Subunit: 170 residues, 6 copies
């Protein structure tokens, strides 16, 4: 199914296949590219869990050979393997032990969740929500030897849009 979902349904939206639902315990899942199966990547050893629904845009390629990764801000978790129709609003800038690490910040389209309609940019998101996202990524690998993540900042909507465009065209 992953090879036949489009990256974008229209000009304004992106399709994001969820791998890890918000607040759903210690399991990190990842889709295997060459089989389409959902693999357990890790039983996490902290008490932490994802601050948003996490997944990727199908039919995309980042610089690292992986699809473009997305954090979908939502009011509720969604099952792994399900697709949320979203719009990009910004990007989370990070660095891990192997270099640059960017995630798109997206919200569901208004036909899925009208309460996000007024959310157009990162500045419209709750400060504590953003602090919590930062805290999660800066700390979720603290007990994992060899691996770390540092947040460097945020990028705007235009940056999110160009990165997704670059991932579709690459």
């Amino acid at each position: 199914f992953i090879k036949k979902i489009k990256a974008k349904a229209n000009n304004n939206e992106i399709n994001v296949i969820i791998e890890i639902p918000m607040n759903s315990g210690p399991i990190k899942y990842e889709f295997d590219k060459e089989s389409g199966a959902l693999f357990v990547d890790r039983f996490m050893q902290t008490t932490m869990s994802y601050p948003c629904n996490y997944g990727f845009i199908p039919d995309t390629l980042s610089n690292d050979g992986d699809p473009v990764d997305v954090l979908v801000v939502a009011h509720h978790p969604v099952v792994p393997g399900s697709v949320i129709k979203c719009r990009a609003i910004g990007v989370l800038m990070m660095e891990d032990e192997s270099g640059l690490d960017e995630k798109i910040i997206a919200v569901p389209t208004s036909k899925l969740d009208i309460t996000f309609d007024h959310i157009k940019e990162l500045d419209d998101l709750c400060e504590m929500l953003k602090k919590r996202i930062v805290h999660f990524f800066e700390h979720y690998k603290d007990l994992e030897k060899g691996k770390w993540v540092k947040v460097t900042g945020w990028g705007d909507k235009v940056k999110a849009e160009t990165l997704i465009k670059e991932g579709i065209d690459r």
Copy 2:
């Protein structure tokens, strides 16, 4: 997998691909027929959640080209995308903003849940469950602009079987 499952395993059962589990919060899921992926359709704005497991019968086309939809009465939710083996016992009749809408009422086979063995028709279901199904569909689109639902009535098992048969034939 949707394009690989028969509508009926035998004369007396239907396969029902589940989209929305019973009593499982505000998420409304739907299979996209082109990709075969399960899409989030809506984060529902009411406090309501589905009174039965909800899905469709593969390899059927209803009147309007959509697969035949099913309410699987059960005691427990199942995973979205899992398939329940069922038998039809009736149909729920409604009207929505785009016209006539009908949903089959079904129960698992006795091989799956023996406790449903003696439920042969709608009248075998308790009154309050039927009332809750009606009240759900009448009200779950109350906060959704442009979209409404009104329940017309019920039809028996023979009406369900004819509806399923015409779905398989149309497919």
Copy 3:
């Protein structure tokens, strides 16, 4: 599509029934790749382990080699755990004889299982719960029963897996 083994020290296990997940028994259908509800269990019992099978395997029952993955947390149905076999559980039932592989996540998935090399490393009460589950879970199912006969060691598990892969 998915290998039975990623390397010599590992098995891939597709989960059908998560540990401690209520009454639903699931089973993957080969031809469709769909997850079918097998039954709604009539007892108050749940699986004591994540339960599934090794892809690309075939045992004498005509089914793939099935596996009880000992774990600290449930995993969603249809997800794949990277594992290693440590033992086998031996059973008899109404259909003949039955064997389930006892596996644990690789140390890449869950470092806390690194010290678990054999069945003797599993805690006693876990093994008793496992035995108790299989001996009683079909109690309210007419015409079906299970009886646990014993355990098999690591090499026995590897042999059963090798044989499953060849067949």
Copy 4:
């Protein structure tokens, strides 16, 4: 609060203080009568959970001095320590390591859940629920050293009402 609740609100009702919710994992709770605190009794070692909401009737004393205990057949779990208004429909008769053991079977009053209104006797409950209640109690102490339970049979409504009345009179 245990000390401030009547056994019976009216002639056809019992107040039931819940210790263990149905289907709520491996925790077995019990009210300490001296402190009024809810203690953890056991982290159960089987995979089993309670088939009904389980508790006792305040201001009753069974033949062995314990309060009269009750299985409350309901469609949903209730928080530990909460009180459900019920009517008795029967008794489950058992034998344990200490000796004779009896649990009243009750359902919520119609004011709390109208769907229980037509359940008057034990034969009105479905066969598989009764078999599951029996199966639970016969096996839940299987992994517990020195403790066992054996079901000896069921008693009707009149039997439950007598047992409750003797319970109040003994208190």
Copy 5:
């Protein structure tokens, strides 16, 4: 034993029914202090907010002043949320007037609610869901109904609370 107010800008709210917690309605019994099951609700609906009451208060119904606490998470029945009122929901039931205070946790419990000072600060879909719930949660209960007639401001709420304490 619990005060109605910790200070001038705060009310203590004992929770009876947590938000999004299924069909059970609970009510505290004053004499025993026990949490009674009031109803197994027959709809698929659940409470849109944490629902409880201000201890040491008396309304016209003979009950304490009740309160819908806007929160991001459920809290256990019997626990106490430190709150502040921002408004009132005005309703009419089969027995007369039905008023309920709209409260938010204090900034010491949840800083994200600091900017919510009046009902206009609450998002409108939430307010629509609140109204929807109260207008339909008694639909399957014979002889009982509710009509929402409007909202009242913070001053209206503080007056209602002060009277409840005085009474």
Copy 6:
């Protein structure tokens, strides 16, 4: 009920009233000893939740005026307000913004959970559990202005028992 439960049932046992169940989301509860009610202390803003069942020994008085606090290592969460019968095996030593901060480390007695019979000292707990507990306390207040926690080390069973005895006798 709080003022009716004993601190210790026998020589080998402590009674611990649970305020916060392990892995049970953002809600941080605390008993008000003046009223006996369970208050919400905080809606936590991180993705973290308690790694143990957390509560106190009733009828105890610490140096700081509060009951002796306990982290009960257990295999499952327990409802708030319920009492677990435990034995102390050690102490978590910490400092917060207002000074010394010790928590007892306990396990259920063998009559409640036999799988803890062999755990007699902190060395018997697995390393990752202890790393997770340390990590929780060092970070759970990161998003809370003016409050912090530093872990200084661990004390043995004797230190635990002395602290408990001091709390009962104070």
